[PDB]
Design a protein around this nucleic acid. Structure first.
Ligand code: K
Ligand code: K
Ligand code: K
Ligand code: K
Ligand code: K
Ligand code: K
Ligand code: K
Ligand code: K
Ligand code: K
Ligand code: K
Ligand code: K
Ligand code: K
Ligand code: K
Ligand code: K
Ligand code: K
Ligand code: K
Ligand code: K
Ligand code: K
Ligand code: MG
Ligand code: MG
Ligand code: MG
Ligand code: MG
Ligand code: MG
Ligand code: MG
Ligand code: MG
Ligand code: MG
Ligand code: MG
Ligand code: MG
Ligand code: MG
Ligand code: MG
Ligand code: MG
Ligand code: MG
Ligand code: MG
Ligand code: MG
Ligand code: ZN
Lengths: 103, 163, 186, 49, 49, 98
RNA sequence: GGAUGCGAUCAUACCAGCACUAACGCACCGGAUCCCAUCAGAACUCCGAAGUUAAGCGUGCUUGGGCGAGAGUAGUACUAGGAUGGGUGACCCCCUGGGAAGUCCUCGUGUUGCAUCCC
RNA sequence: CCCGUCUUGAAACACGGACCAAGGAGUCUGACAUGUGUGCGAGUCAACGGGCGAGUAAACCCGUAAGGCGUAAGGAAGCUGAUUGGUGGGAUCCCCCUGAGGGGUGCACCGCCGACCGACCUUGAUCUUCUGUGAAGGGUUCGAGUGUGAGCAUACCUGUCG
RNA sequence: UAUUCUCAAACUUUAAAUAGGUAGGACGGUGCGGCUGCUUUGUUGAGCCGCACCACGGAAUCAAGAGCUCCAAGUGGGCCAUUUUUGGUAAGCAGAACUGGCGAUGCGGGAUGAACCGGAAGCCGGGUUACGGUGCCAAACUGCGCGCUAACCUAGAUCCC
RNA sequence: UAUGACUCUCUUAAGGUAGCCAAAUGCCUCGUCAUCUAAUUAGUGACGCGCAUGAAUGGAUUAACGAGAUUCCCACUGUCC
RNA sequence: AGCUCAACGAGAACAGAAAUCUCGUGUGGAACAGAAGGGUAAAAGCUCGUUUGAUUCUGAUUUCCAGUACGAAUACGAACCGUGAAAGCGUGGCCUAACGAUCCUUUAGACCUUCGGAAUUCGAAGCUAGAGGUGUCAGAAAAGUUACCACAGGGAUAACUGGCUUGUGGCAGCCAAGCGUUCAUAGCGACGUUGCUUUUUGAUCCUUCGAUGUCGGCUCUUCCUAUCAUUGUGAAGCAGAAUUCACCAAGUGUUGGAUUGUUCACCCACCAAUAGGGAACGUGAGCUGGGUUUAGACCGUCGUGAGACAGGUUAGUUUUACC
């Protein structure tokens, strides 16, 4: 080691050459996923290709509590308030989450 | 440190002058030091406080600070390929006002006076002093001439006072 | 033999032409070579010399700093061999005549809206061939991150040079040599 | 010291010549390089030629 | 196998390659290390100028 | 060396901030606690197989230690610590020289 | 022309032996109640003015010692640079420059600032 | 005097070399750093992914409060968080006169000294939920700070390191 | 007591040569006014700041120019020489000071040679030299002159040698 | 005269007994004496404060044996002249 | 604050060289912790009085030096103090040496910070300053042996020859106090002093460690002279005989054996004589292999031991030429 340089801390002391993952299949993966999406759309026609409806939820922690995103599924209390039976909601394209609490 | 003490090889440098030891005259403490004054560093072997390192003994510097008992002196020191302006503090007993620039102000005043006179009379002059140059020719009055000849050799006179 | 250093030849290197391959910059260089040769103008010579300089030697000038320097001289053509960037800290933009190698889109829009003009160096040659009534400006050359790491080493006394560190925090070069409680300070 | 004085006198090559005004400083400078040079009082003919 | 211990040979030549350089003295020198009381009074005088 | 039983010395406690009377004792290193994080780490490292995991100093060279005086201020009861130079024999309040 | 008080320089001012000094001073000098101090009123401290210039201080002299300056030692010793210089060597001459110190000899023995006082 | 090599010193009684052909040794990758070229610029970066498209591993397009770096620093931490300068040199330009002149202009950079933010110390009117606030006033202390941004991406040589 | 022979790296009154430091203006001077919480018995000083005037560049010579910054290679076995110089009987030994040289450098001379003398170098023509030479080897006189030597020991024959 | 049968002591428990030796074990050393030879640093026998011998870390001896190490004599011979 | 030390001179009963006391001289010739060098005289020395500046806070500088750290030291600033009438002095020792990082432990300081769901209290973890130590002292935690041995290298480095040198060894010279029945020099040469040689041994480390076969003997040739014998001479304390000194002189010769591996040495014998030496301490692809110097084994001494020994002993592969 010589000169004024940042102290090196490369993590290359194992057989790292045997655990290298390349991305030469990125376009192929994109093509495969698009083909799967097209097949699923053809299968579920005329159901929407975007999938089942999802709830609106807040971001976790103080860094993201001002943000709104998509949750896993509607709560049982939300379904009861809306008048949709929980056993029927999944069959008509509504995601159901029996864990989410309404505070 | 590193094989040599602070005062190593100062037997003669830091000793006082012959028949000049003892009490220090009051003129040493009755001197005035100001910023920018040139001072010579002369270590007094009897004053062990504020003693400069032996290197600065016998060197001239400029005053940059004035404390109650000491003065700051800026001394040039050659270290390899450059000169460092090292700043030290030295008690007034170890320092003496330098005479390295005694005639500068006098010369400037005389140059200004001469330039003023030249301008008054309408002339251009140079006040620069010049090195001693060749002298002109002159006549020397003839006097009695004494002849010098090589001395015949005598081995008896080879010793101081004779053998 | 002759007692000369390197046979009396120079050992200093300076730019004699742009290292860039920009054809427009080459044309500007030709223009100002002609101007320097046939006018002997100090302004033209300075412009020609700066046209050769590298990117870091042509730092940008902020709009707020440009306004501050042009205050009281709005009638003169301000000339910078470099880029002019917008400043969101500047509220009032007066009418200015500005010549530069490039303007950012926001800076150009603000100048045009305020009522000034953005000029190229060919237009500057047409307007002030000898650089008359011009305000020649330079950006901050030493105001970059790399400069902070230059100078005396971080570990020597009286040095405020920034060290090279992969991360910032308590565990990253703060213990020994930086504190009186861990060995020595500085 | 000899090399520096010869540079100051502008004598960088063997059989280079230069005029020098007589001064205490110049004479003392020349005294240091005496073994490397020969000098004298030029004639009017010498200077003209 | 013993080796040489020390010598200053060639060091003066090395120094004179680029030296001896005198740092340029600016008109105003740093006030660090001067009498703090005097410096404080000077700062107050400057502030009240 | 012999040091006196009492000493008039500065006390930087907010109560005094001046010279005060101090009682002089000799500092002694306290007992090592098993709850110290360093001791816990050392015990964890030593547990299991591998033998000694940290250095054990052997090349002792010093023949003396630096004696530390505990000066307890009689006004505020707070303690200050003062090292002294290396010595082979130390005592507090010994008979004064005759 | 001096003295005294405070000094500068710190022997041309010191050391030793002799001789001298008008006036004011400086001193020596008389005591121990007080302040003060010791074995010792010797010293130090306090209070004085009987007596003396004997001493101190000051000045002068010594074919005196020392000290200071000069001459000389001596262009000697030493020394920077040069030589395809001499010489077996040791050392040394020469060329361009610098340049000491004992002995011996001669001279001299303080100069001064501020303030008060006597003449 | 025989090349190459190590060496203070090689033609060496120093080592390799009987001869010819072909092969034969500073590379690729990751993290940084200076320099230079290019784009944009208080921003910059669409290639994780998505929409497509040379019927297509390319090219093109897409950033919702995404994320990285930058845009604020000082403290171990609780926590607090930049009042916006002066001056000596100095490039360029403008006037008067043609002196190494005078006046105005004073970018970059350098020297010096203030001010502001924070760690520490010190200080304390008024309010206040009684432990907070902060009129005034500071400091031979400390910082990889502030005082009208300079970065981000990308290409290559060189250098350290795995 | 007055003389006297001879001495010192770790003695010295005295005391060189060489070498070491500082200064010789535009970052100056003079005259006014101002600031202070420092300083003084005292706007007494100490620094600093404004205005006015002067300042022929303030010794010589040279100046193939001066300053500043960034990244980085190789090197970290040296050796030789005049003078100074330590240990050692001495050494082509071992170790230091200044400078130069070889190493990294050919070229002419010393027959021959890393260091000696001369001198440093693009490829050529002409002219002239340095050191060293001019009986042959081998370019240049058996050139013009004065003395000494006679070697029956291999007479003698050029710094380092 | 010398030594010490005898008595007392120190380290550390004791203080080399019976034996054996210039030994395959001795520096001085080619030790001293006798013998073997014309001549012997070799061999043998003897002596012994033995650098540094010694008792199953076995001491001393020993018939018979040995492709074991050594000295001498007879026979024998091209080992040699 | 006061005083002046060592030493010397002159005096006082025991008392003297040396006890205590008096006067005079006394430039430090004493003392100042220690090594040495500086420094100090109404003091830095001795005596006495009062004391704890050997105190707190951080910065600056010097020495070392990379102008890093540590140690040590210096000058200011901000406090509190000691002493003195006061100026002033004091930030350990008159100055130049006397000492120590990370991690961890432990002590002192704050109505200090944190234990991350919220409180209280223990406990723990933080901040500032010391202490426990690294003497290989810029700071690992560390016993031998190898002849059973191994690897990368080194002629940067020993064990031969060769090279420089010649102390030591060997071989000569000069002077002349003396020896030689008298007489310095027929023959010698004390006290001193100048040389030569590289057949001694040392000193050094220049060449050789990708190797120049390491003792001695045998055989064979050549070379030197500082000449043992032989040829020719001069000198004598040369009557003869014998002997000794010296000069030309290297043509010729210089032997057979006992002991020892021996070089060396010592004896026996002959002889004219049994001189001294070189040639890579001549000569191993010429021999030999007794000794040194691998691996087996015994003894003595040493070591707890593995093993060691400049001590002894016995057995232990000598390769290749046709260039
Ligand atoms: K770097
Ligand atoms: K373990
Ligand atoms: K090699
Ligand atoms: K070879
Ligand atoms: K962003
Ligand atoms: K903190
Ligand atoms: K290096
Ligand atoms: K015992
Ligand atoms: K038995
Ligand atoms: K057998
Ligand atoms: K002290
Ligand atoms: K070490
Ligand atoms: K082992
Ligand atoms: K010899
Ligand atoms: K050798
Ligand atoms: K070898
Ligand atoms: K034989
Ligand atoms: K056998
Ligand atoms: Mg266990
Ligand atoms: Mg009288
Ligand atoms: Mg006299
Ligand atoms: Mg975001
Ligand atoms: Mg010198
Ligand atoms: Mg030469
Ligand atoms: Mg030619
Ligand atoms: Mg027995
Ligand atoms: Mg037996
Ligand atoms: Mg006193
Ligand atoms: Mg410690
Ligand atoms: Mg802890
Ligand atoms: Mg006779
Ligand atoms: Mg002969
Ligand atoms: Mg013969
Ligand atoms: Mg045993
Ligand atoms: Zn207290």
């Amino acid at each position: 080691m010589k000169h004024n340089n940042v102290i090196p801390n490369g993590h290359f002391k194992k057989h790292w050459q045997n655990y290298v993952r390349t991305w030469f299949n990125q376009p192929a993966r994109k093509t495969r996923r698009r083909a799967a999406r097209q097949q699923k759309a053809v299968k579920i026609f005329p159901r929407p290709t975007a999938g089942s409806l999802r709830p609106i939820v807040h971001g976790q922690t103080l860094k993201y509590n001002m943000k709104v995103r998509a949750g896993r599924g509607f709560s049982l209390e939300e379904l009861k308030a809306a008048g949709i039976p929980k056993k029927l909601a999944p069959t008509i394209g509504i995601a159901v989450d029996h864990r989410r609490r309404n505070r | 440190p590193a094989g040599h003490g602070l005062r190593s090889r100062t037997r003669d440098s830091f000793s006082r002058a012959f028949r000049k030891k003892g009490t220090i005259p009051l003129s040493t403490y009755l001197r005035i030091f100001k910023i920018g004054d040139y001072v010579d560093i002369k270590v007094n072997g009897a004053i062990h406080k504020g003693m400069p390192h032996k290197f600065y003994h016998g060197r001239t510097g400029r005053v940059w600070n004035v404390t109650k008992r000491a003065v700051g002196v800026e001394v040039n020191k050659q270290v390899r390929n450059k000169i460092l302006r090292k700043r030290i503090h030295v008690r007034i007993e170890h320092v003496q006002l330098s005479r390295c620039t005694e005639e500068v102000k006098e010369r400037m005043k005389k140059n200004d006076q001469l330039k003023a006179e030249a301008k008054a009379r309408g002339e251009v002059i140079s006040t620069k002093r010049q090195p001693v140059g060749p002298k002109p020719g002159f006549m020397v009055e003839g006097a009695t001439l004494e002849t010098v000849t090589p001395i015949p050799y005598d081995v008896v006179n080879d010793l101081k006072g004779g053998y | 033999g002759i007692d000369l250093k390197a046979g009396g030849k120079s050992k200093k290197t300076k730019r004699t032409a742009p290292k860039s391959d920009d054809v427009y910059l080459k044309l500007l260089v030709k223009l100002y070579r002609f101007l320097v040769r046939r006018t002997g103008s100090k302004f033209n010579a300075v412009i020609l010399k700066r046209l050769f300089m590298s990117k870091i030697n042509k730092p940008p000038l902020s709009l707020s700093r440009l306004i501050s320097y042009a205050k009281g001289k709005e009638d003169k053509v301000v000339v910078i061999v470099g880029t002019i960037t917008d400043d969101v800290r500047a509220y009032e933009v007066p009418a200015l005549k500005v010549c530069a190698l490039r303007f950012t889109k926001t800076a150009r829009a603000r100048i045009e809206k305020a009522g000034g003009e953005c000029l190229t160096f060919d237009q500057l040659a047409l307007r002030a061939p000898l650089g008359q009534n011009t305000l020649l400006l330079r950006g901050p050359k030493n105001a970059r991150e790399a400069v902070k790491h230059f100078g005396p080493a971080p570990g020597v006394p009286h040095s405020h040079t920034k060290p090279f560190v992969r991360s910032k925090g308590r565990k990253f070069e703060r213990a020994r040599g930086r504190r009186n409680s861990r060995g020595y300070k500085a | 010291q000899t090399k520096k004085i010869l540079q100051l006198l502008r004598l960088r090559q063997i059989f280079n010549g230069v005029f020098l005004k007589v001064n205490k400083a110049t004479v003392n400078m020349l005294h240091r390089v005496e073994p490397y040079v020969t000098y004298g009082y030029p004639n009017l003919k010498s200077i003209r030629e | 196998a013993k080796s040489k211990n020390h010598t200053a040979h060639n060091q003066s030549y090395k120094a004179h390659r680029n030296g001896i350089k005198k740092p340029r003295k600016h008109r105003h020198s740093s006030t660090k290390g001067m009498d703090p009381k005097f410096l404080r009074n000077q700062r107050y005088a400057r502030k009240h100028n | 060396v012999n040091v006196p039983k009492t000493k008039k010395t500065y006390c930087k406690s907010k109560e005094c901030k001046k010279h005060t009377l101090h009682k002089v004792t000799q500092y002694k290193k306290g007992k090592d606690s098993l709850a110290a994080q360093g001791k816990r780490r050392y015990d964890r490292k030593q547990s299991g197989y591998g033998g000694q995991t940290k250095p054990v100093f052997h090349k002792k060279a010093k023949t003396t230690k630096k004696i530390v005086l505990r000066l307890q201020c009689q006004g505020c009861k707070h303690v200050s610590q003062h090292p002294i130079k290396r010595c082979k024999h130390f005592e507090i309040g010994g008979d004064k020289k005759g």
